[PDB]
Design a protein around this ligand. Sequence first.
Ligand SMILES: [Cl-]
Ligand SMILES: [Cl-]
Ligand SMILES: [Cl-]
Ligand SMILES: [Cl-]
Ligand SMILES: [Cl-]
Ligand SMILES: [Cl-]
Ligand SMILES: [Cl-]
Ligand SMILES: [Cl-]
Ligand SMILES: [Cl-]
Ligand SMILES: [Cl-]
Ligand SMILES: [Cl-]
Ligand SMILES: [Cl-]
Ligand SMILES: [Cl-]
Ligand SMILES: [Cl-]
Ligand SMILES: [Cl-]
Ligand SMILES: [Cl-]
Ligand SMILES: [Cl-]
Ligand SMILES: [Cl-]
Ligand SMILES: [Mn+2]
Ligand SMILES: [Mn+2]
Ligand SMILES: [Mn+2]
Ligand SMILES: [Mn+2]
Ligand SMILES: [Mn+2]
Ligand SMILES: [Mn+2]
Ligand SMILES: [Mn+2]
Ligand SMILES: [Mn+2]
Ligand SMILES: [Mn+2]
Ligand SMILES: [Mn+2]
Ligand SMILES: [Mn+2]
Ligand SMILES: [Mn+2]
Ligand SMILES: [Mn+2]
Ligand SMILES: [Mn+2]
Ligand SMILES: [Mn+2]
Ligand SMILES: [Mn+2]
Ligand SMILES: [Mn+2]
Ligand SMILES: [Mn+2]
Ligand SMILES: [Mn+2]
Ligand SMILES: [Mn+2]
Ligand SMILES: [Mn+2]
Ligand SMILES: [Mn+2]
Ligand SMILES: [Mn+2]
Ligand SMILES: [Mn+2]
Ligand code: NA
Ligand code: NA
Ligand code: NA
Ligand code: NA
Ligand code: NA
Ligand code: NA
Lengths: 175, 175, 175, 175, 175, 175
Amino acid sequence: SLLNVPAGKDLPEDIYVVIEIPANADPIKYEIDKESGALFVDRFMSTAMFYPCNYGYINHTLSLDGDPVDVLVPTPYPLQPGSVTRCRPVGVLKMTDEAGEDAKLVAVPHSKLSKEYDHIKDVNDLPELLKAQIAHFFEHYKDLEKGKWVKVEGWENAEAAKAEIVASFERAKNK
Amino acid sequence: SLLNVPAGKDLPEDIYVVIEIPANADPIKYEIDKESGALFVDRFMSTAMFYPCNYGYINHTLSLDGDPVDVLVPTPYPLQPGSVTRCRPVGVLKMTDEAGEDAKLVAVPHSKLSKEYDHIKDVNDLPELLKAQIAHFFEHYKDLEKGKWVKVEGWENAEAAKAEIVASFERAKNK
Amino acid sequence: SLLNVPAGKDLPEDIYVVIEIPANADPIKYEIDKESGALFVDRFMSTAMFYPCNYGYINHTLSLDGDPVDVLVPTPYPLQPGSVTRCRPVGVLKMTDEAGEDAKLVAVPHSKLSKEYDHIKDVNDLPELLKAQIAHFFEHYKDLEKGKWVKVEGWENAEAAKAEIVASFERAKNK
Amino acid sequence: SLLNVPAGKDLPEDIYVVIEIPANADPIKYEIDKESGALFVDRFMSTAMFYPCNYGYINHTLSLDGDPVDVLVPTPYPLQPGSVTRCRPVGVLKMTDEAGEDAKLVAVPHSKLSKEYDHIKDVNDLPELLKAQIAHFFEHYKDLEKGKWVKVEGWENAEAAKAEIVASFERAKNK
Amino acid sequence: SLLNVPAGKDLPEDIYVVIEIPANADPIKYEIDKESGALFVDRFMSTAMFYPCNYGYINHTLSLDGDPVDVLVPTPYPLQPGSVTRCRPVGVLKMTDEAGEDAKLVAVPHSKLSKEYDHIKDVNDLPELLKAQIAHFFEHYKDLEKGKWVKVEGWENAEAAKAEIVASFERAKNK
Amino acid sequence: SLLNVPAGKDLPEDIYVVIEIPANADPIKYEIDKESGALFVDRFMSTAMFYPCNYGYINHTLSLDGDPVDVLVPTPYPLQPGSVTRCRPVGVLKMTDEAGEDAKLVAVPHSKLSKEYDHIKDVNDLPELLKAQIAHFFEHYKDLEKGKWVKVEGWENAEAAKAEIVASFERAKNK
Ligand SMILES: [Cl-]
Ligand SMILES: [Cl-]
Ligand SMILES: [Cl-]
Ligand SMILES: [Cl-]
Ligand SMILES: [Cl-]
Ligand SMILES: [Cl-]
Ligand SMILES: [Cl-]
Ligand SMILES: [Cl-]
Ligand SMILES: [Cl-]
Ligand SMILES: [Cl-]
Ligand SMILES: [Cl-]
Ligand SMILES: [Cl-]
Ligand SMILES: [Cl-]
Ligand SMILES: [Cl-]
Ligand SMILES: [Cl-]
Ligand SMILES: [Cl-]
Ligand SMILES: [Cl-]
Ligand SMILES: [Cl-]
Ligand SMILES: [Mn+2]
Ligand SMILES: [Mn+2]
Ligand SMILES: [Mn+2]
Ligand SMILES: [Mn+2]
Ligand SMILES: [Mn+2]
Ligand SMILES: [Mn+2]
Ligand SMILES: [Mn+2]
Ligand SMILES: [Mn+2]
Ligand SMILES: [Mn+2]
Ligand SMILES: [Mn+2]
Ligand SMILES: [Mn+2]
Ligand SMILES: [Mn+2]
Ligand SMILES: [Mn+2]
Ligand SMILES: [Mn+2]
Ligand SMILES: [Mn+2]
Ligand SMILES: [Mn+2]
Ligand SMILES: [Mn+2]
Ligand SMILES: [Mn+2]
Ligand SMILES: [Mn+2]
Ligand SMILES: [Mn+2]
Ligand SMILES: [Mn+2]
Ligand SMILES: [Mn+2]
Ligand SMILES: [Mn+2]
Ligand SMILES: [Mn+2]
Ligand code: NA
Ligand code: NA
Ligand code: NA
Ligand code: NA
Ligand code: NA
Ligand code: NA
């Protein structure tokens, strides 16, 4: 089941990301059900916005928001909901939402899957446009959902991303 | 597995629907395999028709046709095969097919997923065009499949839909 | 050529809308070139947003922004860029952008194309969600384009939409 | 303009077909406007059906229904509305609709475009399933449009198709 | 789980194929993880090529390359990754890749799913174009992947395909 | 008509490209008809390959192959066939095909359309993967078309691209 996928081959530099939402998709927010391992519809988003990258999480981790830590994965073609991709973290958008601290990691496909992103070493190697679009998305996608909100602190480097991943792994390991 | 999804949070008004076929999709009829929980191809449909809504079933239920009761879910964007959506029943198209009584429930996304369908309270709130298109689809989609057929009795209200769901739940609970 | 399409059969209640951008499309802003009648790329939009309806204009009209008046057309399936649809106005979102007063009409498919929208008589018949999504789109889609901006005054009724169309027709007829 | 495309290189065996509707598309019926050469929306179809092949017409021809003769073109990938494909006729579905005699030609891509259909010499070389699906589509697609209807006479061979094309060409040449 | 799907109802003539990659899809190579049963991204392909048919494997089998035997399934519409289709083998493209002998079976949808391919009895009934396209794909898709390669021996008949399936089944049954 | 689009605002650094084939599209080769300005199907490609970028030409130019000079335009979303995009040349793949010298320019969206490609100044700024994929595509896409072929000389810089554009413009201006 997706429930049994490892957090990673070599945490925090070598991770697996379970994809819930494809890049450039309709505005349906899917979540994996920790009960059944099935993809559930969480929300039909009300704003005319789309996730700028594939979106998902690292299994066996937990954010302050109560769910596994979230990850954005850019790829040359959108991924399948429910699929898993081997990734390498390069940056993180620190932010909080109405359910807890809720960082958004950016992890690129592992060089074993492609050489395309090998040149993305750290957060400043990400295109400025993409980072701007990501931040803008989290700032506004819940603009029409009463009671939900976001506050974006800011972009941090790979070292912070990795620390995030270790902290998230531990918090699941005992909580 | 999809095999373990509940029939619902609060049967019959608060249900979960396992989706097998997306709205406005190619004419491939998928079914979930009660054995493995996998999506199997049941038929390549021969008519140039498409399911007018997302189509699937309520788990842990059974129709006279031998499979879980069937549900049509309108949504603003097509759902993923294999996904589960929380829904509220609003009407039912009574019909029989060559394998048994085979009602088609209509259930809308739960208000917790969206406010869009909250105004659809009962069967007369559904667009006339949509109901006509649904009935017309079940009447004709098997027109080129020898030995398969449909007889559409007619549209009934939410109260009947709900009764349908309770009867289907029981029939599975002991059969 | 698209250059020769009429403003309408019976202005302002019976209009033709030239579509430039389909509903639920990638974020490419196309414009028709008054020179050649060809569809030109105007902008690759930088925000992760999509036009909530098909978007285009009424030919032989002119807004204060210097181009034909703009129209949003909801339809059950996205339209082809470059196509023309017969429509009936039902409301208008008054707004200004950096290039002039820049109202966004909402016009539904003419009953001769479908009976689906015949029940949408005036602006309050439009779904609240859709109106909210439209306004939210115009407010934020240029958020990452320096020097471009929007100020949304508000939604007005069909009578205002129609007046808008007459004023736009005249301004082209002599300017 | 599309208005200026020839009927064909070598009528009736070597024709050009202007495509209005792609294969396996949403149920939007586009027509080219003889006025402007633009693609206009004619109808939002009400049944959950799709054209089984690309659909369009031969320019400079006229059917009894008042418009150019209609053609179905199977291809390995759907064509663009507005595009033109060189084709060879292989059969025809004789039928009448509420506006006049309204034969539906079947023409395959010319061998100069592909060798794929060279083996389709005449109507019996077309897959039985495809012919059945076509006939079934014309019989039922207008089932929910009051006042519109179809009566399918039957499938005839290439020789008849060709005769159809010659008669249609003449009727335009003087009417 | 997909892990539990049978090799087939009646090996080798009546098989089940687990689909990993749809026909005419983006160039993402998915593989099912024998650990978790999840679809993993194996590679982002570097060449501008696509699998000419749906692609997957027969469960409970093993090729010399170390994974279940591979199968190409033509269908009228692309299948869902993760789905299972009942198929009948009709031919096989013998080939070796850098990881072992790596035959590519061609199996058509079972007549119980459709009558469309019933006329494809053996390898010579497959379209020449399709066979050429398949061979050409395996010959070149790894052209930009250093260290990976293919050598195509050639097309063989259904009898060979079936033998392949039996040998693959045995090799898994004890290895 | 597309026939009337200019070669460019400021040749050779500021050009317009008429798009014939979208990025990541089905393998249908469209060409614009210099007669009618319509998009014609030139070929159904036989290999399982796709153009790695949007593909088209510069109007009012002519290559030795007898048609306007060809251009590849990378963009974040595929363009519409028939559309025109303002571009800036950055490199060129010199190559010959069976109809004459047949260079393939690479031009990126003009900074007025987006800031995304402003950092692509010259050919070495293009991703190595993309250049490899382009060359590989032209080398192999005609592999199954008897009598057609390609010989790729190699990648040259923006200065060469520009020279190419000037030479192509002149050759049309008097031939
Ligand atoms: Cl783990
Ligand atoms: Cl969030
Ligand atoms: Cl930012
Ligand atoms: Cl239950
Ligand atoms: Cl049924
Ligand atoms: Cl009805
Ligand atoms: Cl007018
Ligand atoms: Cl605007
Ligand atoms: Cl509003
Ligand atoms: Cl002619
Ligand atoms: Cl008709
Ligand atoms: Cl028939
Ligand atoms: Cl087995
Ligand atoms: Cl392989
Ligand atoms: Cl071959
Ligand atoms: Cl010029
Ligand atoms: Cl070429
Ligand atoms: Cl190269
Ligand atoms: Mn959540
Ligand atoms: Mn999450
Ligand atoms: Mn959150
Ligand atoms: Mn979260
Ligand atoms: Mn069934
Ligand atoms: Mn069912
Ligand atoms: Mn049934
Ligand atoms: Mn049933
Ligand atoms: Mn503008
Ligand atoms: Mn406009
Ligand atoms: Mn504006
Ligand atoms: Mn405007
Ligand atoms: Mn008509
Ligand atoms: Mn017609
Ligand atoms: Mn007709
Ligand atoms: Mn007709
Ligand atoms: Mn492998
Ligand atoms: Mn395999
Ligand atoms: Mn292999
Ligand atoms: Mn293999
Ligand atoms: Mn050419
Ligand atoms: Mn060209
Ligand atoms: Mn060429
Ligand atoms: Mn050329
Ligand atoms: Na909110
Ligand atoms: Na039947
Ligand atoms: Na701005
Ligand atoms: Na009718
Ligand atoms: Na290689
Ligand atoms: Na060749």
